Amino acid sequence: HMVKVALAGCPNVGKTSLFNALTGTKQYVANWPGVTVEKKEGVFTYKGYTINLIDLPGTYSLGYSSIDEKIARDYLLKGDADLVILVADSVNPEQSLYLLLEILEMEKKVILAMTAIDEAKKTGMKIDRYELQKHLGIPVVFTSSVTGEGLEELKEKIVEYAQKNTHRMILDYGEKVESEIKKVENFLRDKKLRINPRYFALKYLSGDPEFYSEGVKLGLPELSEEERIGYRLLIAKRKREYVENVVKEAFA
């Protein structure tokens, strides 16, 4: 019947074009409650299914300082979505895949839509959609807002995947960081979190404005400024080299 889907992605990767292509005129250019930040919501039907699509603000990352990131992350973490579509620029995927990893660590249902695939075709690129799926462990679809390719296939994956029985091991951050994560996880075991403890741990150690402060209120130790920076750089670096590897394998 009703499927609620969030469109996440960096800025300028074709997220808005894809939104428009899926919903056509059946959309509103509204705003997030109390602020001027644009919020596009739309609807489309596929095989007797209604999909309510919400476009989230473009974000290169999901921290908690800028209004865009706070809004996008708030909806992902504290929101209503049944699954997420990570919109990636198929010509320059690095930054999109980095964002993807952050969301996979949230343990949300994700589909990767590689958009602007006609531009990738034209530049002579070779992208192996099946290689990507193997690496990332999620459905991957090639789409083009310009030619309309992959659009109906994406809708297919949305309804199929949304009603499919639900990505638990993702990234190894080295013994030091992994041990700290475990220590944090143990501490939170008896707490009633609304997100998995591993993600909480990564963001707390990393000094995220919301997760660090909250973690300390729950009784976790305070961290120096150097520690929080240290943890965040290491975590970022690991994500990066993972991304570079995926690209090395799936992009020829």
Automatic annotation (TrEMBL):
The organism of origin for this protein: Thermotoga maritima (strain ATCC 43589 / DSM 3109 / JCM 10099 / NBRC 100826 / MSB8)
Binding residue positions for GDP: N12, V13, G14, K15, T16, S17, A116, D118, S145
Descriptive protein name: Ferrous iron transport protein B
Binding residues for GTP: 9-16, 34-38, 55-58
Biological role: Probable transporter of a GTP-driven Fe(2+) uptake system.
Domain FeoB-type G: 3-164
Family label: Belongs to the TRAFAC class TrmE-Era-EngA-EngB-Septin-like GTPase superfamily. FeoB GTPase (TC 9.A.8) family.
Span of the entire protein shown here: 17 to 268 of 669
Residues that hold Mg(2+) 2 according to the record: N20, A21, T23, G24, D89
Binding sites annotated in the UniProt record for Mg(2+) 1: T16
Compartments reported by the entry: Cell inner membrane; Cell membrane
